[PDB]
Amino acid sequence: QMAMYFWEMGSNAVSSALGACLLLRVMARLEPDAEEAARRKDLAFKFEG
Amino acid sequence: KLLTWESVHKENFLLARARDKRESDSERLKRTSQKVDLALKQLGHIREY
Amino acid sequence: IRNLLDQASHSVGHVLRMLLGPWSDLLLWALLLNRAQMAMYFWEMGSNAVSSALGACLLLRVMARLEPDAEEAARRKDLAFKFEGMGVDLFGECYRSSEVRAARLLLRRCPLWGDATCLQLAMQADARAFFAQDGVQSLLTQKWWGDMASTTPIWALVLAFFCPPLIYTRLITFRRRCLRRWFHFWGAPVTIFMGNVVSYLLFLLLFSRVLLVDFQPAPPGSLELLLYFWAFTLLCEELRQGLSGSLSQRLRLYLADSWNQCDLVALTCFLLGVGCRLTPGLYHLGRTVLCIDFMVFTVRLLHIFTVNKQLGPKIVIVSKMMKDVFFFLFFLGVWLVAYGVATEGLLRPRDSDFPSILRRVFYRPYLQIFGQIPQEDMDVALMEHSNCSSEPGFWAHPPGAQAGTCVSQYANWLVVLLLVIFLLVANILLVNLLIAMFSYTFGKVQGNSDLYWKAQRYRLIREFHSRPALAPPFIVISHLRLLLRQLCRRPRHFRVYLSKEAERKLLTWESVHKENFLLARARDKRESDSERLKRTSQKVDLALKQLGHIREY
Amino acid sequence: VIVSKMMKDVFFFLFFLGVWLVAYGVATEGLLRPRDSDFPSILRRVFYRPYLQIFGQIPQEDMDVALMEHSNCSSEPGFWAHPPGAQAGTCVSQYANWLVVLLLVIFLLVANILLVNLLIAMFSYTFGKVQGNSDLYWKAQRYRLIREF
Amino acid sequence: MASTGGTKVVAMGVAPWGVVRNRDTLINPKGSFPARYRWRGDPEDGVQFPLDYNYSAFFLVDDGTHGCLGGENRFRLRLESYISQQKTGVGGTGIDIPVLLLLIDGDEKMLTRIENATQAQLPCLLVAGSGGAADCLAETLEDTLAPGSGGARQGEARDRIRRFFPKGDLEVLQAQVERIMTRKELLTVYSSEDGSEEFETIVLKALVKACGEASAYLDELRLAVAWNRVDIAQSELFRGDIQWRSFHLEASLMDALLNDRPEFVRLLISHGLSLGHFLTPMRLAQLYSAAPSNSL
Ligand SMILES: CC(C)CCC[C@@H](C)[C@H]1CC[C@H]2[C@@H]3CC=C4C[C@@H](OC(=O)CCC(=O)O)CC[C@]4(C)[C@H]3CC[C@]12C
Ligand SMILES: CC(C)CCC[C@@H](C)[C@H]1CC[C@H]2[C@@H]3CC=C4C[C@@H](OC(=O)CCC(=O)O)CC[C@]4(C)[C@H]3CC[C@]12C
Ligand SMILES: CC(C)CCC[C@@H](C)[C@H]1CC[C@H]2[C@@H]3CC=C4C[C@@H](OC(=O)CCC(=O)O)CC[C@]4(C)[C@H]3CC[C@]12C
Ligand SMILES: CC(C)CCC[C@@H](C)[C@H]1CC[C@H]2[C@@H]3CC=C4C[C@@H](OC(=O)CCC(=O)O)CC[C@]4(C)[C@H]3CC[C@]12C
Ligand SMILES: CC(C)CCC[C@@H](C)[C@H]1CC[C@H]2[C@@H]3CC=C4C[C@@H](OC(=O)CCC(=O)O)CC[C@]4(C)[C@H]3CC[C@]12C
């Protein structure tokens, strides 16, 4: 919820929305469990859409 | 000038879906139930009369 | 129930022998007496909550088969759906938390429900939506690849199957330390199944080898007797499986499940092939039956591959397409009689033997659907004219060997026309309308059949576990271990063991996820817009009662 | 990009036919017994000659004895009727050739009627499914390709 | 049962061991039993009180023989002092936790109970209109220098203590009240018929008087963040003599960030922070230090 708001205040807002969606797909490949990854990868979908 | 034009369209878009959030029927039932109950608290302190 | 108690008084059926006149007990009572709202709550307080949700869904499908009326059964069977779909939703919370410990939920022995495994309680219950969810399907892959890391590739199972040295490599990761590595490879249900596929194609290779070449009228040779010793073990496996998987009560349940019939037809026919092949009189009839017998064993290979995760769903579809074929088979068979006899009546062949008259009214029109249109045998304008008949007409002998020696030519403008109408009905109407029937039912039944194949997948997976690891050529070694097992007793599946202390830690973690799930959907119930209108109307009216007692002022 | 997604449906057709091509092909080659039984030719009449019957090439004169000319071409005690084909064997049998005619009829019902028209049901379904995903997929790929050039 | 959603409120019932009468003597190997208590089975109701099946814990205290209710008192004041030393926030950083005694009416021993709480700096929260120990103290805290008649109330306190206590030794029962009233400010009166929904702010009101200039400045708004209650934090910042300085907002946003709480973050940025004096690189390293240990 805080990543959404910090996006809403800073500039570069299109690219930071894709830059967020970059790292969260990357971090979800680095999570050992399926429950933290799919929660991280769902928050990638929120920054993409 | 590329950023500030784009950040205008962010603050125009955030203040567009916040209006659609507040004017959703799920939020009018949220807000009216926070007004009827708040009107009942004004009725709780006239019962002593 | 009352009569069912009174039936059991003077005397699932074991529940009758167990129940006679705390949470668990209450729940049981509720279920037995259909207290539908109370069965839900008694589930919400007791432990074993996943298995009691499947154990509820077990009995309510059983009780709905024992209800004489349709109104109490369908009310009982609908309350089975509520315990299934809530056991689905509760396991989905448990699987998304700890995939290792939710896997231990299924393989746990609950002491209730006749000490049934939670996967076994779901397949007795025919709970297909419990097998549809990805927590059970991923757990079914792990048992299918039993101690072989179910994200294993397909091709490197094959290379390890033909190289048992390649088992002891960096590949095929798993979970006497040399001998421990051996049995966890070959005892897994992938390697048993592949050993039952590789051997069975070698049965079909051997069967074909003994059918196309090594089948001389003599008394039989090497490769024929090796086929007999082979299919004696296919008779043994199927027999043993059927008797295991009280004697003749298992028999009638074995004569259902229609691929067990095709296992019976194949072997039954096979015998009648070997029995006619060994007698000198019936040799040519003996080969004719064994050629039909090769087809039944080859279609038996199409039932072996319904365990596959890529083919299995599909194989189950083409049995659902049989109602569409039987309409094509009827509509054509109406139209094949209509076109075929009218053609054979218009042109009059002089060779009118019943094996040949029946060949030009069914077989020659049937082959026109598949491109074989003998114009020279039906159209006189492509024939050579002759006075081949003595009857007063014009004839024009056709060149075909089974078109009759001498057809007529009177209305052969119409036979040309009737061919044109036939190709419009058969190839254009009927073939392309069957694709409309296939494309529709493949839309319908696939969402049901893939829902159906999940449960079947589990059953199949479970089976191979009791099946021994050795190939059916070599399974005499495995069947003599069972015959020595029932003789060493005379002078005297998955089933993960839960520890006594690990059981409550399994339960209390699972009962946390129940109380977390019940307090999640109760919030979604209270925050529904139907409930906010429910609660505000209970607040406006209650605020109006505070206005009713100020009106006196 | 779609016809790579249709490969799972072809591989079911390729399996279901390959089951049925072994079943029809060996049972036909076992009923009629050609004397020319070389392994390049025995393998040609159990896979290749049934496979071509799916595509209109149905050699009746090579499977049905009633379209052949009868001869004592073999020495084994039966009735034979030499077929005219170059790779149908010099001398097939004729014992149960009512059934080879019947087994051809069952084959054309499974291969051309069941299997071909059930594959179109599989193609029409997955073209409904995967196209909304693959056109969503091809957009990104389009960009990558564009960037490359 | 009133709010059917709820969050299953937690309540530690610190009792003495020698009072619980239906002690099943829980399993001497390691204490791991799920052993159930026998609840209604007692014809006695004397000095043999049971334990209640409504508390999430029960810190039984074994002073001596089965008897009086005195041993557990020195434990809890030793306990609640330790609780107050413990900090609140993910990573052990934030505020010292707020502990407060709620004084519904008691006895002679209840007055010397809360003297020790003042000695360990506990903000007592006595309720007016209660009775024996509270209203004996509630009449004294409203009897300070400006409402009282100077030194004439020093003789009046002889009378009013006897009104709630018919029992003897009034002299130290007078004398210990001024020992309490040396503190006088780690103590507030819950005004009768003036709270019960404002209680959550009166609890808030007592802590600021307690922290008001040594105890790790509680700042009144950093506290509402740690309680995760948004409606307090707005009305504290929107109203109530709005004189918030820099560092009052600076450490408040830290606990809004370290503890997750994003709705408090939007409030503080709405009232504006520096973000160029806030994002000093110590605080970013502070922000990354509160990552969970078993993370990726
Ligand atoms: C020289 C002799 C000993 C070998 C005889 C040749 C064939 C009879 C063998 C060699 C390659 C084998 C195939 C290689 C690939 C596999 C994958 C295998 O898939 C699985 O069993 C696991 C997948 C699943 O069911 O989930 C099925 C058997 C199969 C087709 C094998 C079937 C039999 C084959 C054709
Ligand atoms: C009068 C002439 C045209 C013969 C008509 C007979 C047909 C009605 C029968 C004979 C052989 C049958 C086929 C032989 C092999 C099988 C495998 C079978 O595969 C499965 O679906 C297994 C799944 C399951 O049964 O659970 C599907 C039906 C099928 C194609 C049969 C489809 C219908 C056929 C053509
Ligand atoms: C696909 C739907 C429309 C049903 C159609 C079924 C027929 C196309 C099939 C089923 C039975 C078959 C017959 C089974 C028995 C034989 C006898 C056989 O004659 C002989 O045995 C002696 C040789 C000769 O002189 O023909 C010729 C073919 C025939 C009629 C077969 C021709 C084609 C038939 C009629
Ligand atoms: C035993 C006999 C019947 C041979 C069986 C082999 C087939 C499985 C293979 C051989 C050649 C293949 C084809 C050769 C050309 C390609 C192009 C290819 O086009 C794409 O989709 C590119 C898109 C992409 O891959 O990203 C699709 C598969 C296809 C049609 C192949 C489909 C399957 C085929 C027939
Ligand atoms: C489409 C699905 C059901 C799989 C079916 C595959 C077969 C239709 C294909 C794959 C391999 C092919 C064979 C590859 C090797 C040759 C050997 C070739 O014989 C010779 O080389 C010598 C010449 C002669 O005497 O025939 C004859 C055809 C044949 C069997 C081909 C015939 C058709 C085959 C069996």
UniProtKB/Swiss-Prot annotation, chain C:
Effect caused by changing D379A: Results in a non-functional channel with a dominant negative phenotype
Residues in coiled coil: 519-553
Membrane spanning stretches: 193-213, 225-245, 259-279, 282-305, 326-346, 415-435
Short motif (Selectivity filter): ranges: 370-372
Domain description: TRPM4, is a temperature-sensitive ion channel, it adopts distinct conformations at different temperatures, markedly influencing where and how ligands interact with it. Decavanadate (a positive modulator), ATP (an inhibitor) and Ca(2+) bind to different locations of TRPM4 at physiological temperatures or at lower temperatures.
Protein known as: Transient receptor potential cation channel subfamily M member 4
Outcome reported for the amino acid change (mutating K77 to A/M): Becomes insensitive to decavanadate's voltage modulation effect
Disulfide partners: C388-C406
Effect in UniProt of substituting Y200H: In PFHB1B; atrioventricular block
Protein residues bound to Ca(2+) 2: E238, Q241, N260, D263
Region annotation Mediates modulation by decavanadate and PIP2-binding: where it falls in the sequence: 521-526
Disease: Progressive familial heart block 1B: A cardiac bundle branch disorder characterized by progressive alteration of cardiac conduction through the His-Purkinje system, with a pattern of a right bundle-branch block and/or left anterior hemiblock occurring individually or together. It leads to complete atrio-ventricular block causing syncope and sudden death. Erythrokeratodermia variabilis et progressiva 6: A form of erythrokeratodermia variabilis et progressiva, a genodermatosis characterized by the coexistence of two independent skin lesions: transient erythema and hyperkeratosis that is usually localized but occasionally occurs in its generalized form. Clinical presentation varies significantly within a family and from one family to another. Palmoplantar keratoderma is present in around 50% of cases. EKVP6 inheritance is autosomal dominant.
Taxonomy, superkingdom: Eukaryota
Residue spans that sit within the membrane without traversing it, per the record: 359-379
